[PDB]
Design a protein around this ligand. Structure first.
Ligand SMILES: Nc1nc2c(ncn2[C@@H]2O[C@H](COP(=O)(O)OP(=O)(O)OP(=O)(O)O)[C@@H](O)[C@H]2O)c(=O)[nH]1
Ligand SMILES: Nc1nc2c(ncn2[C@@H]2O[C@H](COP(=O)(O)OP(=O)(O)O)[C@@H](O)[C@H]2O)c(=O)[nH]1
Ligand SMILES: Nc1nc2c(ncn2[C@@H]2O[C@H](COP(=O)(O)OP(=O)(O)O)[C@@H](O)[C@H]2O)c(=O)[nH]1
Ligand SMILES: [Mg+2]
Lengths: 427, 430, 108, 193, 427
């Protein structure tokens, strides 16, 4: 009884949310009509974490869908798992996204905020317990970047204790979909640092890199791209849903990996990944999984660890497997590469085991780590922001909404210190 | 008659308790439902018209491990009150498990443990299990021990805990929780045993031929140790030893109590057919550092009084001859002010094998509990690890926000420093 | 696969058709050379029939259909045949076509 | 006490837990003979996580006993036998069909009909009323509680016929009364409510 | 044996009454031809409350229909259940209604009153016992508002002991149909205050609001509007018709809810109400029902209670359901919202549990409450009635019938004190 409330925002969050709910529904064995048709009793042990039961044996997830324009919602309705979601949970506006942070925060955010908050309060206070909230959104967009940060502040005000773990997608450095990305990402950073307990950063360039190199797909679709992200989300909460040799929930994850309140940005990765033709040839044991997790090519954030140093690291395993073999790998991978860890924290790698692996996979693993390599990521946006901000004009569309020009300086003031904050703690 | 109450804290404690009570059931011959197809009283109570219920209390702040027992095969054995489960675990934080969430449930458990003692006419002590790195094992264990000290006073409180491994680690904050619990345990515990998984992993692979063990194998070996210790109170013998006898003979001082453990013979079925397993043969194996359940070499330190417990075919002759041979070992050192150094107990009940067991059916066995200055090596490694984290204040914010005052961090540091001074001051001869 | 056999020198060639996003290296499956059966004997036209399981180098292939000129030349050797057994469907291709069916088919 | 039924039970435990033994039983084979000691097999089974009963052990040991040695069990043969239950490795030879995903996955009725009479007349829903006792959402409760709720509704039936329903609707694993399918059968015979 | 005699006045009463007799015909299982074709023996336990038997197995209702023009009766005759009614119970005039209270009360009221009374006497003195009468009429029109108040006085003169329960529809301000409704409502209130034991107020504004908010009907017709009203009056008499764990009939309701003889105007509420596209996902439980009843939006009276304070409240439940679960909600809901309850009466919430629920619903609930928010309702009409008095408006139409101008002064004066009477009890 540690119910988790799932929040989606905008075009990016809804597509990822739609695919993500396919993974868990298959894992527990929920028919698209909403009725359990699974294969074992353990799936019903703690299905209450993500599902509510309606009278009639039909289970409905604790999902909230938020957007400013109805176009994204109608696609979700016609999706394969569209019937699953509760109709009242769809909250949408009647105005364009605008791709503007100020417009989504001030102009259209306020009206939606009060309507959304009542919807959350329905699910938040409907269950015997609630561990924390879960957010999936993009920072380069307009709705998820603007309104998502506004709701993030309101959730903390009402429910300080709960874990506000968020999944974010960061604007790509090389080629991206939006000109005004530097403003929206920079403005959203200040709200994320002070309010969110845990932040996972995901980049589309890393996802494309994996699809070519590891999965050998000729034309990677968003369906394959969203699938990889969804499997990470299922891995983190797997300890709550299923038994294991050593349980490790969200609050355990934050305590170990976060040594200081503002140093909590994480990079993530998943193993095993294999092309459809190679899986015949590949032997799969515990040492093989550990090879991918620390390998830089498997990181879903385009930040090479070798250029920085590690502070903390956490790995989760699923499936029946030797406890000695997991603990031995953690010691070796730490002693073998002592050049990439800080001396002042020993035992930098946390471990965990879960009993039941995902369908088809006998064993699987998930990696969450904290490193100073994020200084590369925010360097890219800050450098681009400086060029655009010296050109005073593009702020025009932000000022008309009510955003004061000083906010850009305060927005640039804070994440500059965050880049600094990672600089000194490398020593 | 003369009974013992066992309490288990944390997931490690519950899983160790699972194996230990499995050993008790088949050793007395009790079916999983509590029926029969003697010393039952010492560990079980006759209640259900043919049925026995164990004298145990299982405590954890999260339901997963306890619900495995609730849904497991052995569920019908336990009274529902004996299995207590919390709502959210301490998240490997000593502060959360002691002050905020621990105090939510402390007075619930103390009622059940006091209730079970009412039926216990001949209670002689408590056996307590911890995981030092875990949040519930340390924070909640400290709160429980502090209350049990004043609730009952002069009743033996024996501990059997999982000390952190020298290099193997699964939790980053492990050094913080270990030192804070150290101050609480040292004053309130009558005698506290220590084992570590790293030394176990080496032992269940070398002597017992297992390539890749799990936590299940380690818990089964731990069960054997407890069974031999309690065998004197439960079966026929020629030299019985009571809870007061281990404690009076093993601890020369109040704060020196900490013993170390070993078990012999540990061996596989194929190997057992080739050797004789004589009394001197099994006795000689105990003293090697390889068999030690704690990864510390006795040759670094010295030996104070020791205890040996034999089971089965053993005859008092071969005990005295074997112990006399041990005294001739110059590779073994003893302090000058303890020339006697030994107490031996002999019992007739041989060890019992398990369905799906790991060990061979040996006709005779021996277990030892001994105090040595070599444990000061273990405390030194933990102390150095703590200072590196506390020098840069790596994790203080988590602990302070959950009720702990920061002044407790140096105070527990000071107590460990005094304890290390206690060991080296005593170690010197005069 | 596509099995090509040469009447000039009895060599055989197998070419797997390329498929969108198959994820498997596709192309020439076996280079043109004389094929020795499991009995250490060379494969000949006398072995191929339409509807009979043909094994080569640890694998077994099932002959489904023949080309128009292949039908005619085999007709002059009385080796023709038509089996109702089509290729069993690939479940993985079925599911991806349904996902692509979701993207394309019908809001009407 | 049966080789085949125990083999079927182990395969079902394999499908539910998604576990392969070739990891554990291949450790002890230091010479790659395909044979290991019987007691290492006993240790390997417990390590594998399944709680095999003693009776099942010696029947397995007797059936997979070796001829080249004393008390050696052909672990490779045993591991292959369970693996074949999923799919033969010779599928590079065409013929075999795989399980796909579907092959992997009067006294009583008289009492049922009278219960249906009561529910139709009353317009009851039983599935919401048993919920008080099936903690951990297994939806299987003790026989006493199953009976006890029934006259909490108020259908004071004779004692022996209630135990008859417990006998037929028994859940073999927990030895409890399975009320999930019981409620489905009850509401179906009542019809629309 | 607690027979209830039904009276229906005007275009409003005949339409609503016809729909009401459908619902009871559904619940007891009466064929439209007037014969029993049901499914349960309990239906015939106490069907005598609302029905008589014509020799031959035909059951007829204890209903009397009243109007001034035959147009509405013919609409009732040709309805689906029209032939069920007794032929002689149709009483009608041969003159237009006119929407004039004075014309309805004096000119055509006296002629019809004598003929109607003997028809009532036939049904009133045909049964073993008679607990009370049931009146359905509108207060904005001329037929139900005019002749209904005249019949109400004569019923009280002959039958003082019996319960004269009435259901009324208040003329909705700013919306309602005709120009002269404030005159008709003002004159009728004085007759209602002294004569009627219980009065339930229903506003057409709330029925429209509930349909759009809750039932999500794009085109709400009078069929759906009357259906929702039919549930409440069906629920109130359900305790008489079926067994239960704790019975509560009309006379129990009046004693508990009425602290002083004049403060007895009530608001009514019903739950559950769910859109036909969302009823499958809803987790209908006892606390869920309590949420809807006390939710301010579910009241069919357009008077928000939070602007006022509560004096008494009563809830009825229908289903096989725990007594403890019911009894706990009252204490919780009363303790949480203590700011809305008077402190000189504790335990302001009454209860009852009836066994058999309505068809289709596993369980349902009914709410009737009394609050000082009625001062909002009478303020709207009084101000509207004031502005038609200043320039004397249409009163000349009322004078020709025989109404003295002082009757308007006494009608406003009585309501003025009634508004004041609710003011003092707020203290
Ligand atoms: N030997 C052995 N050690 C175990 C076993 N299970 C857990 N442990 C030890 O327990 C530690 C993990 O902490 P937990 O098991 O969660 O103990 P806890 O007190 O419940 O901690 P919280 O979960 O935060 O409440 C690890 O360091 C393990 O070494 C076991 O089965 N055998
Ligand atoms: N990985 C991934 N990215 C997406 C998907 N859909 C949209 N995006 C990206 O999300 C970024 C921001 O999208 P936007 O529509 O502005 O989001 P919003 O305005 O905040 O709701 C764009 O650059 C898109 O390329 C998806 O399904 N998967
Ligand atoms: N809720 C509801 N209101 C109605 C219905 N029919 C009429 N009304 C309302 O009743 C009011 C007055 O009705 P009226 O024709 O004067 O009835 P009469 O004077 O008693 O015969 C009008 O404002 C209508 O809006 C109905 O079927 N349902
Ligand atoms: Mg714990």
């Amino acid at each position: 009884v540690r119910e988790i409330v799932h929040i989606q925002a905008g075009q990016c969050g809804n597509q990822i949310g739609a695919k993500f709910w396919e993974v868990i529904s298959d894992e527990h064995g929920i028919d698209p009509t909403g009725s359990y048709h699974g294969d074992s009793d353990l799936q019903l042990e703690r299905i209450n974490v993500y599902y509510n039961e309606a009278t009639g044996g039909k289970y409905v997830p604790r999902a909230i869908l938020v957007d400013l324009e109805p176009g994204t919602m109608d696609s979700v309705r016609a999706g394969q798992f569209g019937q699953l979601f509760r109709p009242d949970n769809f909250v949408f506006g009647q105005s364009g996204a605008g791709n503007n942070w100020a417009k989504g925060y001030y102009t259209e955010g306020q009206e939606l905020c009060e309507s959304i908050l009542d919807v959350i309060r329905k699910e938040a206070e409907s269950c015997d317990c609630l561990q924390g909230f879960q957010l999936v959104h993009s920072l380069g967009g307009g709705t998820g970047a603007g309104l998502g940060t506004l709701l993030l502040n309101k959730l903390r005000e009402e429910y300080p204790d709960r874990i506000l773990s968020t999944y974010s997608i960061v604007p790509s450095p090389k080629v991206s979909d939006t000109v005004v990305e530097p403003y929206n990402c920079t403005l959203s950073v200040h709200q994320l640092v002070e309010s969110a307990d845990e932040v996972f950063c995901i980049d589309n360039e890393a996802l494309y890199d994996i699809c070519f190199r590891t999965l050998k797909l000729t034309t990677p679709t968003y369906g394959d791209l969203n699938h990889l992200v969804s499997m990470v989300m299922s891995g983190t909460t797997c300890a709550l849903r299923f038994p294991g040799q050593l349980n490790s929930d969200l609050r355990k994850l934050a305590v170990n990996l976060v040594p200081f309140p503002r140093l909590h940005f994480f990079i993530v990765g998943f193993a095993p990944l294999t092309s459809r033709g190679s899986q015949q040839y590949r032997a799969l044991t515990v040492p093989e999984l550990t090879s991918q997790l620390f390998d830089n090519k498997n990181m879903m954030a385009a930040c090479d660890p070798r250029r920085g140093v590690y502070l903390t690291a956490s790995a989760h395993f699923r499936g029946r497997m030797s406890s000695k073999e997991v603990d031995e790998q953690m010691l070796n991978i730490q002693a073998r590469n002592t050049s990439y860890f800080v001396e002042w924290i020993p035992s930098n790698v946390k471990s965990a085991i879960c009993d039941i692996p995902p369908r088809g996979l006998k064993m699987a693993a998930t990696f969450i780590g904290n490193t100073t390599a994020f200084r590369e990521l925010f360097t890219r946006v800050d450098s681009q922001f400086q060029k655009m901000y010296a050109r005073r004009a593009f702020i025009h569309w932000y000022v008309n909404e009510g955003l004061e020009t000083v906010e850009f300086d305060e927005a640039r003031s804070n994440m500059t210190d965050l880049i600094q904050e990672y600089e000194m703690y490398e020593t | 008659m003369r009974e013992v109450i066992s309490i288990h804290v944390g997931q490690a404690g519950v899983q160790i308790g699972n194996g230990c009570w499995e050993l008790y059931c088949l050793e007395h011959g009790i079916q999983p439902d509590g029926q029969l197809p003697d010393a039952f009283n010492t560990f079980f109570s006759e209640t259900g018209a043919g049925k026995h219920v164990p004298r145990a209390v299982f405590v954890d702040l999260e339901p997963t491990v306890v619900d495995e027992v609730r849904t497991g095969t052995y569920r019908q054995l336990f009274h529902p009150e004996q299995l207590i489960s919390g709502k959210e675990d301490a998240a490997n934080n000593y502060a959360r498990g002691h002050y905020t969430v621990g105090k939510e449930i402390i007075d619930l458990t103390l009622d059940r443990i006091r209730k079970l003692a009412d039926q216990c006419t001949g209670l002689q002590g408590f056996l307590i299990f911890h995981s030092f790195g875990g949040g519930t094992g340390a924070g909640f264990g400290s709160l429980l021990l502090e209350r049990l000290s004043v609730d009952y006073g002069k009743k033996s409180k024996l501990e059997f805990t999982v000390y952190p491994s020298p290099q193997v680690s699964t939790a980053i904050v492990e050094p913080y929780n270990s030192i804070l619990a150290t101050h609480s345990m040292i004053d309130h515990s009558d005698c506290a045993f220590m084992v570590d998984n790293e030394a176990l992993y080496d032992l269940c692979r070398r002597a017992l031929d297992i390539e890749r063990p799990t936590y299940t194998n380690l818990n089964r070996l731990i069960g054997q140790v407890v069974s031999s210790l309690t065998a004197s109170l439960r079966f026929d013998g020629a030299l019985n030893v009571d809870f007061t006898e281990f404690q009076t003979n093993l601890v020369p001082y109040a704060r020196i109590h900490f013993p170390i453990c070993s078990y012999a013979p540990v061996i596989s079925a194929e190997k057992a057919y080739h050797e004789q397993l004589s009394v001197a043969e099994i006795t000689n194996s105990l003293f090697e550092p390889a068999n030690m359940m704690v990864k510390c070499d006795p040759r670094h330190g010295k030996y104070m009084a020791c205890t040996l417990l034999y089971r089965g075919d053993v005859v008092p002759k071969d005990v005295s001859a074997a112990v006399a041979t041990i005294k001739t070992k110059r590779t073994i050192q003893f302090v000058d002010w303890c020339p006697t150094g030994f107490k031996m107990g002999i019992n007739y009940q041989p060890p019992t094998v398990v369905p799906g067991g790991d060990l061979a059916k040996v006709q005779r066995a021996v277990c030892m509990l001994a105090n040595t200055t070599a444990i000061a090596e273990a405390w030194s490694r933990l102390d150095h690890k703590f200072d590196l984290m506390y020098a840069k204040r790596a994790f203080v914010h988590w602990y302070v926000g959950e009720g702990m005052e920061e002044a407790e961090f140096p105070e527990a540091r000071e107590d460990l420093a005094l304890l290390e001074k206690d060991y080296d001051e005593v170690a010197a001869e005069s | 696969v596509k099995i090509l056999f040469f009447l000039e020198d009895d060599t055989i060639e197998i070419v797997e058709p390329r498929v969108k996003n198959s994820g498997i290296p596709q192309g020439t499956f076996l280079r043109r050379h004389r094929a020795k059966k499991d009995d250490d004997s060379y494969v000949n036209v006398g072995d191929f029939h339409i509807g009979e399981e043909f094994s080569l180098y640890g694998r077994v292939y099932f002959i489904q259909e023949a080309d128009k000129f292949t039908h005619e030349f085999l007709d002059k050797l009385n080796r023709d045949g038509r089996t109702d057994e089509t290729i069993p469907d690939d479940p993985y291709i079925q599911k991806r076509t349904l996902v692509e069916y979701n993207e394309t088919h019908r809001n009407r | 006490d049966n080789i085949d039924d125990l083999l079927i039970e182990m395969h079902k435990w394999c499908l539910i837990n998604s576990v392969l033994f070739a990891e554990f039983l291949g450790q002890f084979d230091t010479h790659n003979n395909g044979e290991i000691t019987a007691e290492h097999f006993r240790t390997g089974i417990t390590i594998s996580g399944y709680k095999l009963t003693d009776k099942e052990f010696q029947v397995l040991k007797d059936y997979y006993a070796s001829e080249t040695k004393k008390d050696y069990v052909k672990w490779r043969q045993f591991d292959k036998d369970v693996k074949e239950m999923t799919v033969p490795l010779d599928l590079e030879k065409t013929p075999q069909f795989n399980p796909l995903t579907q092959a992997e996955l009067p006294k009583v009725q008289e009492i049922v009909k009278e219960i249906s009479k009561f529910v139709r007349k009353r317009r009851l829903s039983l599935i919401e009323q048993f919920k008080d006792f099936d903690k951990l959402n297994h939806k299987k409760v003790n026989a006493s509680h199953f009976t006890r709720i029934l006259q909490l509704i108020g259908c004071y039936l004779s004692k022996d016929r209630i135990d008859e329903l417990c006998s037929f609707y028994n859940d073999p694993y927990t030895k409890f009364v399975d009320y999930g399918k019981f409620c489905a059968d009850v509401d179906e015979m009542t019809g629309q409510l």
